[PDB]
Amino acid sequence: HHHMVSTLKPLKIGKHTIKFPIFQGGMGVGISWDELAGNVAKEGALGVISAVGTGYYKNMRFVERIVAKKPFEALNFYSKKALNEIFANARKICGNNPLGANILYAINDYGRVLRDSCEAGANIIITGAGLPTNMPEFAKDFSDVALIPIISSAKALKILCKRWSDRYKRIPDAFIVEGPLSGGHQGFKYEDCFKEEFRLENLVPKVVEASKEWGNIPIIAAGGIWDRKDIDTMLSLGASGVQMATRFLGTKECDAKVYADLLPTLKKEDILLIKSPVGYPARAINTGVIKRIEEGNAPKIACVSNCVAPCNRGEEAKKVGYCIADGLGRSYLGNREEGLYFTGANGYRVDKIISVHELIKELTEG
Amino acid sequence: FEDIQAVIAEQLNVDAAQVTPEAEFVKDLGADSLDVVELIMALEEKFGIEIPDEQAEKIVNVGDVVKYIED
Ligand SMILES: Cc1cc2nc3c(=O)[nH]c(=O)nc-3n(C[C@H](O)[C@H](O)[C@H](O)COP(=O)(O)O)c2cc1C
Ligand SMILES: *P(=O)(O)OCC(C)(C)[C@H](O)C(=O)NCCC(=O)NCCS
Ligand code: SF4
C-alpha cells in the first residue's frame, strides 16, 4: 500500500489555506514548539506554537534575568527573543506554511505577547482560557493575522462577536469549540465536565447553528478526537475542522521529549482532573508535582515567573499546592519528580510513539 | 436608579422589586458569567457608557454598577 490522497478538503481561515482541516492544538511550555509545529505544518496541517513559558526554551538560553532558577516576571517567562527563535526554527522545517501561536488569555502581559507573536511571524493567533473580548486590540497593526477564540458555548460565540464588532470592527476568523475531554485547562466548572449535556457532539451543532447567524464563521471541534472516524463524525455535524493535541503529544517530534517516555505507560485511572491557579480545571497525569503534593514533599511555592493574572501572585498557587509555571517548565526540562504533566482523556490509548508524518497520514488517507 | 433597575430586571428576567443595591447578580438574581456580560453590554448602550472589563470585574452587586454609572 502506498500513501493515498485525502478526500478531506483544504481549509481557509484568514488569508491562509491549510491543505488538511486539522489543527495541532497548542500545548503549553515547550510541548508544541519549533520541531513539532514545524513538522505538523510541513505535513499540511496547522502547526500551533505555544507562546507560553518560552523563557524556558533551551534551558533559559535567551533570558536576561533568572531568580531561583526560574525566569523572573512576565518579561522573561514570555521571552520575545526565545519566541522569535522558536518561530525561526519552525520555519526552517515548514517554510511559509501557516503557523498558529497559542496564547492563554489569563496570562499577564497578554497583549504584549500577542504582538510578539505577530512580530515573530505567526499567521494565526488562537486564545482560550478566558472569554477573549480584547484579543484584537494588539493585532491592529497585523491585518493578515487571523484570530480564533476558544469557546465552550454558543452564548460565548454571540458575546464575542458582538463585543469584537463594537470595539474593533472585526469578527473572529474562526472559533474552536473545546469539549471537556481535552488536555490542559477545561472550559467548564468541574461539575459540568461530566454531564452529557456538554459532550462535544452536543455542543458542536449548537455553536454551528449560532455561528450561521454571523456569516458562517468556521467551527473547529476539539477535545477527544482520536482518529479519522472521529474527524468525519465532527465534520458531519457541521464543524469545518478539528483540533487535536493528545495524538500529537504522542509523536516523536513533540518538543518535550519526556512525554515520549511517559505516555505509553499511562493507565486510564492515573489521568485526573485537578485544580489550577488559572481558575479552570485541568486534566493532568498522576505524576510529578502531583505525587509530591500527595506525599507532602512538593516544591516550595515562590512566585518568580508571575505567569497568569488569576493566581494573584502565588496566592492561588498555594491554595492549590503547586505553581503551574514552575511545574510545566520543570516538565520541559525533563524533571520527572517535580514536573507537571498534562494529557487529554485519550492519553491512555497511546502505546506506540509515531512520527508526525505517519500520524497525519493515518488521519488523512481517503 | 429606576432606569438601571429596569434594564437589570428585563435582562435577568427578574422583577424590579428584587433589584436592590444590596442584591448580587451572582447569588441573589441567579446569573451565570455570560449573563453578566450581556448585562454590562445592555447598560453601556442604554446609558451610552463604556465599562471596561477591568472596571467591570470589580462589580458584583447592583450598587457597584449604580455607582459606576454615576461617575
Ligand atoms: C499537554 C497539553 C497541553 C495543552 N496546553 C494548552 C495550552 O497551552 N493552550 C491551549 O489553548 N490548549 C492547551 N491544551 C489543549 C489542546 O490545545 C487541545 O485543544 C486539546 O487537548 C484537544 O483535545 P485532545 O488532546 O483530546 O485532542 C493542551 C493539551 C495538552 C494535552
Ligand atoms: P465565566 O466567566 O465563569 O466563563 C468563562 C468561559 C466559559 C466563558 C470561557 O469561555 C472559557 O472557559 N473558555 C475555554 C478556554 C479553554 O477551553 N482552554 C484553555 C486551554 S489550557
Ligand atoms: S505563583 Fe501563580 S502566578 Fe506565580 S508563576 Fe506560579 S502559577 Fe504563575
Numbering used by the authors:
A (entry chain A): -2 to 363
B (entry chain B): 4 to 74
Direct quotes from the study:
The bifunctional dehydrogenase/isomerase FabX is an essential UFA biosynthesis enzyme in the widespread human pathogen Helicobacter pylori, a bacterium etiologically related to 95% of gastric cancers. FabX belongs to the nitronate monooxygenase (NMO) flavoprotein family but contains an atypical [4Fe-4S] cluster absent in all other family members characterized to date. We demonstrate that the [4Fe–4S] cluster functions as a temporary electron depot that receives electrons from FMN and sends electrons back to FMN to achieve independent bidirectional internal electron transfer.
To investigate the acyl-ACP substrate recognition mechanism of FabX, we performed crystal screening of FabX–holo-ACP and FabX–octanoyl-ACP complexes under anaerobic condition which block dehydrogenation of the substrate (FabX requires oxygen for activity). We obtained crystal structures of FabX–holo-ACP complex at 2.8 Å resolution with space group P21 and FabX–octanoyl-ACP complex at 2.3 Å resolution with space group P212121. In contrast to the FabX–octanoyl-ACP complex, both of two FabX–holo-ACP complexes in the asymmetric unit were well determined and essentially identical (RMSD value of 0.4687). holo-ACP binds FabX predominantly through its α2-helix through electrostatic and hydrophobic interactions as expected. The PPant arm of holo-ACP stretches into the active tunnel of FabX, where it is stabilized through hydrophobic interactions with FabX residues including I147, S149, G184, and Y277. Moreover, the O40′ atom of the PPant arm forms an additional H-bond with the sidechain of E175. However, superposition of the FabX–holo-ACP complex with the FabX–octanoyl-ACP complex showed a surprising ~30° rotation between the ACP molecules of the two complexes. Specifically, holo-ACP rotates in the clockwise direction along the α2-helix with the sidechain of FabX R164 acting as the rotation fulcrum, allowing D35′ and D38′ from holo–ACP to form salt-bridges with the sidechain of FabX K152, which were not observed in the FabX–octanoyl-ACP complex. Moreover, the rotation weakens the interactions between α3-helix of octanoyl-ACP and FabX, and abolishes the interaction between D56′ of octanoyl-ACP and FabX T130.
